[PDB]
């Protein structure tokens, strides 16, 4: 019955669910330590409310079921606003905007400009299975070949070693990819072939709760701190 607010200020500690493979969100080094945007975020709201943080490892299939279970408090780490995630939790304000748009070897940059271009007989589309970006592939694609390969980091390798020929994913990585991978570009960063809203997933029910966290969002993008934590990672 009570807000989330009254149980983290007893116990002290904000529990917060993040996924640790999401440079430059959320990223878990072997050490066990998270680094990211939205560990910094995290952070930032932890001292507003005058609690510890401590970071709960989820996954994107389990993110709900975790969620669903109590495993955490919120959730913060490059996770988009969706219907299917309205349903079952609640989102802060959002506090960036992104979309997909594809990533392909730099020598293919001018043809894959438009879906159009993409979706042909003959092109090999590749794709990280069971989220938004096979969502997205499926719904927009009626003539490419489409394959879901499981390996979330040498996905893009596949691309690289001429395997495949577009991914598209979330703008924000194919930022951090095509930096990590000198042979692959993004395609029209600035300007993605969707609009989704980055926020962070909280409880249904607790008007409090979301109310303090957009409180708190609404401050931190004013006050300078948003302006240094992103000009630190994005
Ligand atoms: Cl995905």
Same mark, same amino acid.
Request: glycine share 6%; charged share 25%.
């Given at each position: &019955?009570?807000?989330?607010?009254? *149980?983290?200020?007893?116990? $002290?500690?904000?529990?917060? $669910? ?5 440079? @430059?969100?959320? !990223?878990?080094?072997? +050490? ?38 109590? #495993?955490?408090?919120?959730?913060? $780490?490059? /996770? ?6 309205? #349903?079952?939790? +609640? ?8 979309? #997909?748009? @594809?990533?392909?070897?730099? *020598? ?10 993409? +979706?042909?007989?003959?092109?090999? /589309?590749? /794709?990280?299975? $069971? ?17 879901? !390969? ?35 570009? &993004? ?9 989704? *809203? ?8 607790? @008007? ?17 701190? !948003? ?8």
């Amino acid at each position: &019955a009570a807000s989330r607010l009254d *149980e983290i200020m007893q116990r $002290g500690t904000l529990r917060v $669910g993040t996924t640790g493979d999401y440079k @430059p969100f959320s !990223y878990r080094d072997p +050490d066990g330590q998270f680094t990211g945007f939205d560990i910094d975020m995290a952070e930032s709201l932890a001292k507003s409310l005058g609690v510890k943080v401590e970071f709960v490892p989820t996954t994107w299939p389990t993110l709900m079921d975790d969620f669903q279970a109590d #495993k955490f408090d919120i959730a913060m $780490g490059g /996770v988009s606003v969706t219907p299917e995630r309205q #349903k079952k939790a +609640d989102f802060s304000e959002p506090y960036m905007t992104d979309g #997909k748009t @594809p990533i392909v070897r730099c *020598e293919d940059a001018d043809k894959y400009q438009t879906l159009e271009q993409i +979706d042909r007989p003959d092109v090999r /589309v590749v /794709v990280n299975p $069971g989220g938004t970006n096979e969502r997205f592939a499926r719904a927009h694609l009626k003539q490419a070949q489409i394959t879901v !390969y499981p390996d979330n980091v040498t996905i893009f390798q596949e691309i690289v070693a001429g395997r495949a020929d577009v991914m598209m994913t979330d703008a924000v990585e194919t930022r951090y990819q095509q930096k990590l991978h000198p042979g692959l570009c &993004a395609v029209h960063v600035d300007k993605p072939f969707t609009h989704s *809203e980055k926020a962070y997933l909280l409880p249904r029910g607790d @008007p409090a709760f979301k109310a303090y966290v957009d409180q708190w969002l609404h401050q931190a993008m004013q006050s300078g701190t !948003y302006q240094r934590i992103f000009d630190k990672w994005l």
